[PDB]
Design a protein around this nucleic acid. Structure first.
Length: 59
DNA sequence: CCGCAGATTTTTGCGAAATCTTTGCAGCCAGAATATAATGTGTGCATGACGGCGAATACCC
């Protein structure tokens, strides 16, 4: 905080204090939205032919 | 003071090996790959000169 501080440790703790801890199912929900995003990007790559041609070349 | 002997000088020759690059090997080493249970906490704070001094906010009049 603004306490005439000059230690990066202190305000790093300040930064980490803003975000609240997660639960077991919270991690699963966040990973689920991550999986939705990666499936979206996989579909986007899917609609692109040339990347698939390159993948088939390596196969 | 001159020509040959001892000493010194001239010339041709072979073995040896080391070095530079390439190839095979072994110790060194780097990244890539796998899914054990663990999230607001630690932490060092070590501490008794003395004089000068401006800068930085506070507070009375």
């Amino acid at each position: 905080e603004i306490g005439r501080t000059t230690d990066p440790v202190r305000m790093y703790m300040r930064e980490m204090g803003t975000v609240e801890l997660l639960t077991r199912e919270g991690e699963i929900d966040i990973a689920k939205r991550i999986e939705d995003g990666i499936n979206q990007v996989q579909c986007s790559v899917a609609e692109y032919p040339e990347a698939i041609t390159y993948l088939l070349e390596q196969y």
